[PDB]
Every structure is written in structure tokens, then in C-alpha cells.
């Protein structure tokens, strides 16, 4: 980008790379129900480990996995988001076999359902904010 005279902040590319690094590969299952070679999200395996180390069980051995942008997009947890990207057949078949449920965490799924997106003014952080005036505030303050 610098070569062509485009100023672009590193943070964005970092946002993408972060998603490229999202997945890991199991080296040893340990006490888990997992198996050698199985691929899953880094968050899900660390949540598993921190759970079973508190259960006094052997941790799951794993190595980091770098996959490109397309494959990372298709490997997402949400099947509505994956089916709408590409490989509509493969995604749908594997997800329908797995009996997958889409928890609607992202923007795409919510867009397809026509739901309010979980971002901006649809963010739970700002969504439930209420407005009132001192007159009505005191009027309700009475009771």
C-alpha cells in the first residue's frame, strides 16, 4: 500500500490478520472429547482448557493455525453467514448434518433476518438507554 502512496492505518490489517489467526489444530486430545488433527477456534479450546485445568484434568495440546481469508470466512461458526458467502451447498450440508444453530452474533445473519444489527445504535451497550425530563423524573420520584 505504501508503494502506491496510500496511507492506511495498520490497525485495520491487524483486524483482518486477527481473524486469519482465529483457528488452532489439536496436537493431543488429552482428557477432552476432541481428537488429533481436529480444527477449532482458539477461543473455544482455551475455554475448554481453563475449564478442565480447574477440573484437574490434562490440558488439550494444540498448535496455532494460520488460514487465508476465504477459508477463515467459510470456517466461521455462523452458518447463515457462511452459506451466504460462498460454497452454499457444502456449508449447508455440513451444518444441516451437524444440526448447527446460528446464534446471530454477527451482522450478516441479522441482516438476512431483517433484524436490527448488533452494532451502532443496535449495540446492547447503548440500546436500552432511556430519556426523561426533570419534571417527569421528579413526578415518578414521588411514588
Amino acid at each position: 500500500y505504501r508503494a502506491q502512496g496510500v496511507k492506511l492505518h495498520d490497525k485495520h490489517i491487524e483486524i483482518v490478520v486477527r481473524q486469519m489467526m482465529k483457528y488452532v489444530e489439536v496436537t493431543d486430545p488429552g482428557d477432552s472429547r476432541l481428537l488429533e488433527g481436529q480444527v477449532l477456534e482458539k477461543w473455544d479450546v482455551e475455554a475448554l482448557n481453563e475449564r478442565l485445568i480447574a477440573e484437574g484434568k490434562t490440558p488439550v495440546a494444540w498448535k496455532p493455525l494460520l488460514m487465508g481469508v476465504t477459508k477463515s470466512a467459510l470456517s466461521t461458526k455462523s452458518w447463515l453467514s457462511a452459506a451466504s458467502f460462498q460454497n452454499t451447498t457444502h456449508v449447508l450440508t455440513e451444518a444441516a448434518i451437524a444440526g448447527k444453530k446460528d446464534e446471530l452474533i454477527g451482522l450478516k445473519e441479522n441482516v438476512i433476518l431483517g433484524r436490527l444489527i448488533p452494532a451502532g445504535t443496535g449495540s446492547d451497550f447503548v440500546r436500552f438507554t432511556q430519556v426523561v425530563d426533570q419534571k417527569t423524573l421528579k413526578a415518578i420520584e414521588e411514588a
Binding site: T121, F125, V126, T129, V131, V132, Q134, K135
Partner: protein
Amino acid sequence: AEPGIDKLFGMVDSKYRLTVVVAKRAQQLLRHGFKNTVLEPEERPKMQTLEGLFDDPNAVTWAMKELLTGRLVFGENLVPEDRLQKEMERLYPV
């Protein structure tokens, strides 16, 4: 630019919260026909017509101007929804 937009952005921790507040307040002003306004007669948003100045029909201009005065209070879990709706429909029926 919306007048005093920087102060409005100063009022909240997230710009989107400012948006939610303004929008909700505007819905309140629309429901009750402006009877509930925290603006005094001289502060009322005006609109030039053929005959002469009238009250600004736009509820968002209003809501923002009201917000600029400290006369509004916003936040989460201030009042249950029932109490708010009912008390506002009491003091200002429509």
C-alpha cells in the same frame, strides 16, 4: 453541521447513545404533541413560512435543542417502562 454537535458528543460516552437518546426523545415529543417540551417559548425551534414563523415540525431538531439544555436526563434503568409511559400519558394526554 447540526448546531452544537460537539457538545452533544461531549455529553455521551458513545455517539450511538446520543443517537438513541435523541431518537427516543423525539418519539416522546411526537406522541404527546410537544406538550411535554422542556423548552421555554423563546427557545422553541422556529420555521419560516409564507405567513410567518411557526413551530418547527421536525421533532429531532427539537430533541437535540432540548438535549443542549441540561433539562433532560438520560441513562439506563432509570424508570420501569410502564411507570414512564403512564406518567407521561397522565401529565400529557393525547
